[PDB]
């Protein structure tokens, strides 16, 4: 018949599922206070309306960037590592990794909180890029994020020490190809024995189709506000939906796993270093 959250919990506990693939979206970052840059009410929004942007997405378009890189770097300044901290979801994924159950974590977010929570880069597929590294637009030399950090925090446009071209953070812009590591899905989804989807409807390809790339016998657990996307249209017998608050649902799964105190321990320790 149909499965419950607890069934998944015991599936994890017997470690019959030890190759978990996770896909996350913007929702899991809204509890961290990450401002939606398209939506009014945030300071980022106010700061961004100062410019001649036709629509929010133009902040991730190369022609506009080369016309005026200041809006994008306003965004970059806002979202740069340090300004925000991971929440319970991120640290749950971290614990998932620590117990050796995490095969790969595919993220659409660009806040980089998966890394900050202590998940190794090899376990991550940051499908829309990252602020952790940058590339010069002219001579293509790579740089660590830190190298331009000062420039970014002082509202200066970072210029390359060699050729003086603009040094651009490795965020994937519209029209640009997805990162190479995305192709890991080819091997990751056929190998998965559990699929976790957090804080995203997954309405946009290629993620949508990736939701169906796991084997038919493989359970798909959705923790989101709504049941929409490929999961609604093509339901499978072993699907489980935890609709409602992402944080609350995650807390529920953690409790049901009996990892709650281990979790608060983890959060204590990890918040300690920041």
């Amino acid at each position: 018949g149909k499965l419950s959250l607890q069934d998944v919990a015991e599936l994890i506990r017997a470690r019959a599922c030890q190759r978990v693939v996770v896909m996350v979206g913007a929702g899991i970052s809204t509890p961290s206070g990450i401002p939606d840059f398209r939506s009014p009410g945030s300071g980022l929004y106010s700061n961004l309306q100062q410019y001649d942007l036709p629509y929010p997405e133009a902040i991730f378009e190369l022609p506009f960037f080369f016309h005026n890189p200041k809006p994008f770097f306003t965004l970059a300044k806002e979202l740069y590592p340090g300004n925000y901290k991971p929440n319970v979801t991120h640290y749950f994924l971290r614990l998932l990794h620590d117990k050796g159950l995490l095969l790969r974590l595919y993220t659409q977010n660009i806040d980089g909180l998966e890394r900050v929570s202590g998940i190794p880069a090899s376990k991550l597929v940051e499908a829309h890029g990252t602020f952790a590294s940058a590339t010069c637009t002219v001579c293509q030399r790579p740089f660590p994020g830190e190298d331009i950090r000062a420039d970014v925090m002082a509202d200066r446009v970072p210029r390359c020490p060699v050729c003086t071209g603009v040094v651009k953070p490795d965020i994937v812009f519209f029209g640009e190809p997805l990162p190479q590591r995305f192709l890991l899905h080819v091997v990751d989804f056929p190998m998965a024995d559990l699929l976790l989807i957090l804080g995203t409807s997954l309405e946009v390809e290629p993620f949508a189709s990736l939701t169906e790339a796991v084997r038919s016998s493989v359970p798909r657990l959705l923790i989101n506000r709504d049941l929409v996307g490929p999961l609604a249209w093509h339901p499978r017998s072993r699907d489980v939906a935890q609709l409602g608050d992402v944080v609350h649902g995650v807390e529920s799964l953690v409790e049901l796993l009996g990892w709650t105190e281990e979790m608060r321990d983890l959060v204590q320790r990890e918040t300690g270093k920041l």
């Binding site: 997405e57 991730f60 378009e61 994937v172 519209f174 029209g175 190809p177 997805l178 995305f182 946009v204």
Partner: peptide, 6 residues
């Protein structure tokens, strides 16, 4: 809606 290409 724009798309980063696969």
């Amino acid at each position: 809606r724009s798309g980063k290409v696969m």
